[PDB]
């Protein structure tokens, strides 16, 4: 039987996915360390690797999988359900099995997705220092008209330090921090002014390789919430523009507190749907 993690209603997916807009017709780029194609709750539809001696559909990390999850696990009679579970899925490996990629990875998997036309990407992945090549892809992405979303980071806070990483940092990228069921933000979520949403991202149960389902914390866990919103969305009102989607996505989601700790709160995707 299948499972609706909490992170489900607590965004309101669910009440968009009753209106019947499932993400179907949008393509979602995961960028992260590959997808398990295998997994029968995901449906991979293309992809690229940037990283030697690995195809992009398997994943020997694990993140990516359970990132890709939280975004599109199918909804059938088994596993876990996404936000956005009839989005295409593309598995953009850039990152090898132990978790490392280089910046010139990245570059190519961002680039990939624009060249191809996808709708969204998703990076749950970040590091302290940008690059100038970084910059200009994202850019590129974004005013291509991609949505382009990110972790935040899962470094806290350090009193005034602002711990956002790159390429969630850069303006053209969405900046997702992370709550628990509750609400409260993860001690863990990085803090800064260019935090911009929250999602659920505390003990997120999702697809796991090869065939298992396991719950995970990280911003990386939230991050998906936001482009499955993103893709639901542009279900419902195909033609809109990047800036369009971002703008209902922050400037409907309920305030939980101080932005540099928050941002402007928790998606509410029913309301960002309207
Ligand atoms: C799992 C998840 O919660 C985090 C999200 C995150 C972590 C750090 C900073 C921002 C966001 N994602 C990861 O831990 C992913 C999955 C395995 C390894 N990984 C990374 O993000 C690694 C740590 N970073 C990566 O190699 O970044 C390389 C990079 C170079 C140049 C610019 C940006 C990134
Ligand atoms: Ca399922
Ligand atoms: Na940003």
């Known amino acids: 039987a299948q499972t609706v993690p909490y992170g489900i209603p607590l965004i309101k997916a669910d009440?968009?996915?009753?209106?019947g807009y499932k993400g179907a017709n949008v393509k979602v780029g995961i960028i992260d360390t590959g997808i398990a194609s295998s997994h029968t709750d995901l449906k991979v539809v293309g992809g690229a690797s940037f990283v030697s001696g690995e195809s992009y559909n398997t994943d020997g990390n694990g993140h990516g999988t359970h990132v890709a999850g939280t975004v599109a696990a199918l909804d059938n009679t088994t596993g876990v359900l996404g936000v956005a579970p009839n989005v295409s899925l593309y598995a953009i490996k850039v990152l090898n099995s132990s978790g490392s990629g280089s910046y010139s990875a990245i570059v190519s998997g961002i680039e990939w997705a624009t060249q191809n036309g996808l709708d969204v990407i998703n990076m749950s992945l970040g590091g302290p220092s940008g690059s100038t090549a970084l910059k200009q892809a994202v850019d590129k992405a974004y005013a291509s008209g991609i949505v382009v979303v990110a972790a935040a980071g899962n470094s806290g806070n350090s009193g005034s330090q602002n711990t956002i990483g790159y390429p969630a940092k850069y303006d053209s990228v969405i900046a997702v921090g992370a709550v628990d069921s509750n609400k409260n933000r993860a001690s863990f979520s990085s803090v800064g002014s260019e935090l911009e949403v929250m999602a659920p991202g505390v003990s997120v149960y999702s697809?796991?390789?090869?065939?298992?389902?396991?719950?995970?914390?990280?911003?990386?866990?939230?991050?998906?919430?936001?482009?499955?919103?993103?893709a639901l969305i542009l279900s419902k009102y195909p033609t809109l523009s990047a800036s369009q989607v971002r703008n209902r996505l922050s400037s409907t989601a309920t305030n939980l507190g101080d932005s540099f700790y928050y941002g402007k709160g928790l998606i509410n995707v029913e309301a960002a749907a309207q």
């Open 15 to 19: 009440k968009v996915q009753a209106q």
């Open 207 to 230: 697809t796991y390789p090869s065939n298992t389902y396991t719950s995970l914390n990280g911003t990386s866990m939230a991050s998906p919430h936001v482009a499955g919103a993103a």
